[PDB]
Amino acid sequence: TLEKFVDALPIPDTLKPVQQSKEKTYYEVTMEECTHQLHRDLPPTRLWGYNGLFPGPTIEVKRNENVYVKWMNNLPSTHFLPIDHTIHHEEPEVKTVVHLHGGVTPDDSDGYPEAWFSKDFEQTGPYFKREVYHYPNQQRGAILWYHDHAMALTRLNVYAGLVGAYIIHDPKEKRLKLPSDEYDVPLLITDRTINEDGSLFYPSAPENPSPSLPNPSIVPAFCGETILVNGKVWPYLEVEPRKYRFRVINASNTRTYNLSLDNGGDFIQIGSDGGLLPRSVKLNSFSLAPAERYDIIIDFTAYEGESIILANSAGCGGDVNPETDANIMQFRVTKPLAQKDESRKPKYLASYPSVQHERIQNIRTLKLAGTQDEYGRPVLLLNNKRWHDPVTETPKVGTTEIWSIINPTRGTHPIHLHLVSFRVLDRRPFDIARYQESGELSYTGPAVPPPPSEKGWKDTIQAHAGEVLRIAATFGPYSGRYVWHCHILEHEDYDMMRPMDITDP
Ligand SMILES: [Cu+2]
Ligand SMILES: [Cu+2]
Ligand SMILES: [Cu+2]
Ligand SMILES: [Cu+2]
Ligand SMILES: [O-]
Numbered sequence: 001t002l003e004k005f006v007d008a009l010p011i012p013d014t015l016k017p018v019q020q021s022k023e024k025t026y027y028e029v030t031m032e033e034c035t036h037q038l039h040r041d042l043p044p045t046r047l048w049g050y051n052g053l054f055p056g057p058t059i060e061v062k063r064n065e066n067v068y069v070k071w072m073n074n075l076p077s078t079h080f081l082p083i084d085h086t087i088h089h090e091e092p093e094v095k096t097v098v099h100l101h102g103g104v105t106p107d108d109s110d111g112y113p114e115a116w117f118s119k120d121f122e123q124t125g126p127y128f129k130r131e132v133y134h135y136p137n138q139q140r141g142a143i144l145w146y147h148d149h150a151m152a153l154t155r156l157n158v159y160a161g162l163v164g165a166y167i168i169h170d171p172k173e174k175r176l177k178l179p180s181d182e183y184d185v186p187l188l189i190t191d192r193t194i195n196e197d198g199s200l201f202y203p204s205a206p207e208n209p210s211p212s213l214p215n216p217s218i219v220p221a222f223c224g225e226t227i228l229v230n231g232k233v234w235p236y237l238e239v240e241p242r243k244y245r246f247r248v249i250n251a252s253n254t255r256t257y258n259l260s261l262d263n264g265g266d267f268i269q270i271g272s273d274g275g276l277l278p279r280s281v282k283l284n285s286f287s288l289a290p291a292e293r294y295d296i297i298i299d300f301t302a303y304e305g306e307s308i309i310l311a312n313s314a315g316c317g318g319d320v321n322p323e324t325d326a327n328i329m330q331f332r333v334t335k336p337l338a339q340k341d342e343s344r345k346p347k348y349l350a351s352y353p354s355v356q357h358e359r360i361q362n363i364r365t366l367k368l369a370g371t372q373d374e375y376g377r378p379v380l381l382l383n384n385k386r387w388h389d390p391v392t393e394t395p396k397v398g399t400t401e402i403w404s405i406i407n408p409t410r411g412t413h414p415i416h417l418h419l420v421s422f423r424v425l426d427r428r429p430f431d432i433a434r435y436q437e438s439g440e441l442s443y444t445g446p447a448v449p450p451p452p453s454e455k456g457w458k459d460t461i462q463a464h465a466g467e468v469l470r471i472a473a474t475f476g477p478y479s480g481r482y483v484w485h486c487h488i489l490e491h492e493d494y495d496m497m498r499p500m501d502i503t504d505p
Contacts, residue, residue: 001323002194002226002233005307005330006040009237010230011185012165015057026132027069029056031096031162033076039233043198048075048160054231055188055251056146056164063170067135071098073119081156082204082216086375087494088152092118095125096157099149100135100166101291102142102273102421102459107480109133110418113151113387113497125151127481138477140275140421140457141170143247143293145188155222155253155489159202161231163188163251178270179245179297179343185237186247189288189328191224191255191316194233212375218494220378221254223316229329236330241304242341245270248294253489256412256462258314259328260285261298263306268345271295274421274457276350281452287314289414291460291487294453297345300333307332353423353457358474361399367406368413368463368486370496380486380496391499393484395475405469406441408432413463413491418482418500421457422473424450432466441468460487479504 032052035044050056099111108129116125148157193201204216310328426447485497
């Protein structure tokens with residue numbers, strides 16, 4: 001296997017605007033097929049990248065900054081990854097659309113799966129409205145990320161490399177003196193399988209392919225043999241002996257991580273998907289499912305000279321391998337101090353979400369289920385509805401709802417709601433057999449409130465097997481057509497995604 005910790009961690013450059021005034025910031029990003037070396041000992045890898053980069057450029061904006069991004073497709077007309085033609089039914093093979101994950105975004109700028117476009121916008125999906133996306137950023141400072149969201153192609157386009165970080169800075173938070181600038185570093189974690197010739201491997205069929213299956217065939221999960229951070233296999237980062245802020249983004253298709261430091265040191269979590277937690281939380285380890293973000297401080301002050309591995313204990317299709325996927329990256333505390341560490345790790349970060357006293361307009365009960373197709377494949381479904389079925393999740397703008405998510409399946413699903421961030425209420429175990437047999441919900445234990453990590457704002461939430469998860473969301477400020485889905489991309493594409501109409505009656 002590839003030698004761990006021989007390549008320095010890339011830090012994506014921050015994107016520069018094409019045009020910028022005090023009223024408007026205008027960006028252009030072009031999707032390009034390019035080649036990049038992912039490891040010292042590999043031939044360069046063919047990839048799809050925003051501005052030809054993997055990950056894409058980091059975009060930095062201020063809260064309320066009036067931002068526009070013209071996301072353009074200049075990709076080849078044929079994919080290099082295996083397309084399953086059976087999962088969706090002239091129309092180009094390669095379709096793309098950029099979704100700003102966590103963006104408080106008007107619906108036609110949200111990257112609707114059917115708002116896709118081919119090269120130079122030559123063909124467009126039935127929900128396409130505009131070339132230049134509008135991000136008003138009227139929302140909390142937070143770690144967002146952008147990625148492809150095209151109908152039936154998301155797992156492939158993202159795996160190809162179409163991911164990048166987007167950071168909203170709220171000037172009100174500068175007073176907290178969190179590590180900033182060089183000491184504030186995104187970590188986009190993506191697992192990959194890479195061939196000896198350096199080409200990406202993505203399976204064209206399940207491991208034991210029934211002759212019933214089409215070819216290629218979608219698979220229900222993907223687990224990469226190797227872990228990359230910021231587009232390099234098992235990299236090292238030289239750090240100064242002081243506090244750093246890391247924006248930890250899980251940009252992987254399926255894989256969930258459970259992260260810790262191999263010296264037993266702590267993380268300080270300061271933020272979740274929707275922004276700063278009310279209070280900082282000291283943690284030894286944390287779970288990170290696809291699309292989840294952890295805003296953390298790591299204090300290297302007392303660890304000068306040391307090599308510390310960011311370790312992973314979560315398996316993917318099996319137990320972790322100590323030599324491979326148990327490793328993420330390596331910090332080397334050997335960079336001389338550029339100046340005094342004037343950063344802080346404050347306890348008091350933000351207003352509590354519980355300060356809000358909104359009326360519960362509606363309680364939605366939603367089940368995570370599915371069926372089997374003509375080929376014997378699992379088709380994962382939200383409420384046993386297909387994507388194309390008439391919309392059922394129709395919250396009213398400006399109203400608050402409780403969603404009760406029932407998971408009678410064998411695994412966890414990271415459920416993502418577009419537009420909004422929500423509060424986690426509780427989780428409660430139930431009798432799976434009883435529910436499967438009769439549709440009756442019989443709890444086998446008391447409700448458990450969220451851990452401190454989940455006492456802030458979330459947008460992607462782990463709904464564990466055999467539990468009912470309750471969340472509360474205020475739907476707004478925009479009305480329109482959005483989506484909610486499982487963020488396991490292999491699930492999302494077949495067919496664990498539903499329209500969400502935020503209505504203005
Ligand atoms: Cu997403
Ligand atoms: Cu999203
Ligand atoms: Cu799922
Ligand atoms: Cu999405
Ligand atoms: O998403």
